[model samples]
Target: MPHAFKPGDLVFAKMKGYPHWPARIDDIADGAVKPPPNKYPIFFFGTHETAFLGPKDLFPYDKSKDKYGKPNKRKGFNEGLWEIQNNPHASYS
Candidate 1:
């Protein structure tokens, strides 16, 4: 079952096939169950890949915008989004 977490709360998440990893609740989006909205409660984190590669990681840091601004959703990498170091079985192909 999906665990409920509040913003700013630190928790561990087991990404599908990967082992559990540390994560922080960045923000929350409210919506009705009948009609799912585009916005959702997605936990965001500042991983090594996101901090270095920018667009090569799960969520890229948009330099075009201010540091406090939200990341560019269009430039984010969604597939196989995980911290390599955190996941022992993960490898670079």
Candidate 2:
């Protein structure tokens, strides 16, 4: 199947212990470990942490569908999100 998301597209990253949280695709990456699952690099919102996960680990996210609350409505909102989407790593601080 074609990828459901692309670089810089906002998505929800799902993990065992964490709630389905907001994140954005950093880019396509290769797994350094064995089997190298064509990793998708994603960065989280509040934590600002990053992870490499496959398609199964991610799905689409949108405020209209949000049942929890709003990430964009939170403090500082996301110059982080807007910054990344706007520049695509051409320059970051």
Candidate 3:
């Protein structure tokens, strides 16, 4: 289930398989279901550094718990985006 993302909502976007880096969202697009380069214009922050974002790449920062991605099997948050948003077995590899 996708959340209602609007402008000013900071989010962490990561490449699906690569997990290159986490990009922060400045102005989010509503009902954007496509991948990166399709609606890359929505990101108005970070000076296009994170403009390569797309669907299944944005993640809302858990400010309530002061947390970000969950842990994965590798014990990190860069395990190809599998367990980061859903599991604690996170990995950097």
Candidate 4:
């Protein structure tokens, strides 16, 4: 089941061609039921980057894990996004 989200909530957004990244919900479009409109605008923690993601593209922040279901150690809160942003061409790659 998709987890209900609200503004300012911490969550993870699955970036295209990238692993899930730490993010926070900024706002949600009201009653958005279709893919085109059902987008959750979230901010990447470290870099403060923003993106619109679907329900399936997100998961609980504290529940981060690897493909094998092993707990994946992540950057402390906003650190990960900043780390990625600092790298040249890393954000979109």
Candidate 5:
């Protein structure tokens, strides 16, 4: 099940330990995310280490997905790399 994510792709970010928080996707990225759970890299927006969660923990920024993403919930798109937590949406949480 290949994902639609790739390097150089910007994603969204959550408020670390603050459960399901949502903001914007400056989409800024820089790291080496391995597949099979597109784990995250070091924090960019200076998130907590707990937020260093893997890909399954991140999602992408898609209007369709964002529409469903509620506060303190839907951490990631829970879809595909389309999560694609792009964490522009790192992780698929």
Candidate 6:
């Protein structure tokens, strides 16, 4: 079983090569979870790593999945490059 966290909850997340940073629940995407006890909540978080504050970090904690679905290889900074352009004030920007 997985723990259910709500908005405003404080969480500790480990980013590759970076020490675990304390994060806060920012938003929860609707219909983000898939069916059957295999899926869990996908938490959108704001961390100190970003220049601005927004939901750029995702913490998907499904016991059925490993490391909460976090990528084994760090995602390239350009993975969602367009998002920065779309929202100039985005956390990444």
CA-only RMSD, every prediction:
15.5, 5.1, 10.7, 8.7, 9.4, 11.9
Span of ten consecutive residues with least summed lDDT in model 5: 42-51
- Which candidate do you rate higher for lDDT, 4 or 6? 4
* Candidate No. with top lDDT: 2
Candidate structures ordered by TM-score, highest first: 2, 4, 3, 5, 1, 6
Misplaced by over 4 Å in model 2 are 1-3, 28-35, 68-93
Worst 10 residues of 2 by lDDT: 84-93
Clashing pairs in 2: none
Overall lDDT per candidate, in order of appearance? 0.30, 0.60, 0.42, 0.59, 0.40, 0.35
lDDT of 4 by residue, 1-93 (tens): 654776766566787765677666664348843334778776676556678887788787555533312234554434654443343223322
- Distance from true location, Cα of 79 in model 6, Å: 27
- Best model per TM-score: 2
CA lDDT, candidate 3, residue 92: 20
Go through the candidates in order and give the clash count of each: 0, 0, 11, 0, 35, 0
The residue-by-residue lDDT of candidate 6 on 4-89, one tens digit each, is: 65544444344456433334343434864332342223222332242222233434322212333233233432332222224323
| lDDT for each residue of candidate 2 in 38-67, tens digit (9 for 90 to 100) | 677777655566788887877665542355
lDDT of 2 at 5: 62
Error of 6 at 63 (Å): 19
Candidate 1 clashing pairs, residues 3+ apart or interchain = none
List model 5 lDDT by residue over 1-93, tens digit each: 546555444445444454443333233335634323444442332232223445554555453345535433243323322333433434422
Give the Å shift of residue 7 in candidate 5. Answer: 2.8
Candidate 4 Cα misplacement greater than 4 A, ranges:
1-3, 28-36, 65-78, 81-93
Runs with alpha carbons beyond 4 Å of true place in candidate 5: 1-4, 14-16, 19-38, 42-51, 64-93
**4 versus 5: better lDDT goes to:** 4
